[PDB]
């Protein structure tokens, strides 16, 4: 029969054996080991809000040549430090050190985006507003 039991009473062996082998599932094992909650800069949550420590100019991977504007952000609930990308042209001009920002993932299940080394997050808001809006100029950065 090659290799699994077929018997009418081999149900236990068949469950155990499955259990044992689920641990080769990358998604399954992270789910049960609680990787999210344990490592990983966000809680396991969709976004996180942090504070802008310094503005970085990350040099892009090959075959691409560019300076990818980013920010080091210290997560508020965490103190965990993180570097995040600041999407679109300009937009680095919209941030500032010690500014509050709202980080989100890069849609890649952890894992860096494209030609940006190290970076697994991107900025979504600053001082409670959102890049997008600031960029398309439908809103303005707040006083202080």
């Amino acid at each position: 029969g090659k290799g699994k039991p077929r018997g009418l009473n081999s149900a236990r062996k068949l469950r155990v054996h499955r259990r044992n082998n689920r641990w080769a599932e990358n998604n399954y094992k992270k789910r049960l080991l609680g990787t999210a909650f344990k490592s990983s800069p966000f809680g396991g949550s969709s976004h996180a809000k942090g504070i802008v420590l310094e503005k970085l100019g990350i040099e892009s991977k090959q075959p691409n040549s560019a300076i990818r504007k980013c920010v080091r952000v210290q997560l508020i609930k965490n103190g965990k430090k993180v570097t995040a990308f600041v999407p679109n042209d300009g937009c680095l001009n919209f941030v500032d050190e010690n500014d509050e920002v709202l980080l989100a993932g890069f849609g890649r299940k952890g894992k860096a985006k494209g030609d940006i080394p190290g970076v697994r997050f991107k900025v979504v808001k600053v001082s409670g507003v959102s890049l997008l809006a600031l960029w398309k100029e439908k809103k303005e950065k707040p006083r202080s």
């Binding site: 970085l56 100019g57 990350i58 040099e59 300076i67 042209d89 001009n93």
Partner: protein, 60 residues
């Protein structure tokens, strides 16, 4: 990799593409009327069949 590259040039292009304003044009009907206009464009009167068909041709 290197991590303190220049930052001087943020927004370079967007700030130096010259503005040109949007041009006042007819208003397109919204809703069902727009599907209506799509239908007569695509199927009823038709336009060209240079071999097959095109939707956004320019200088053809």
């Amino acid at each position: 990799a290197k991590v303190h590259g220049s930052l001087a040039r943020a927004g370079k292009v967007k700030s130096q593409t010259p503005k040109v304003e949007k041009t006042e044009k007819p208003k397109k009907p919204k809703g069902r009327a727009y599907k209506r206009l799509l239908y007569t464009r695509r199927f009823v009167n038709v336009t060209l069949v240079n071999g097959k068909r095109r939707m956004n041709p320019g200088p053809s």
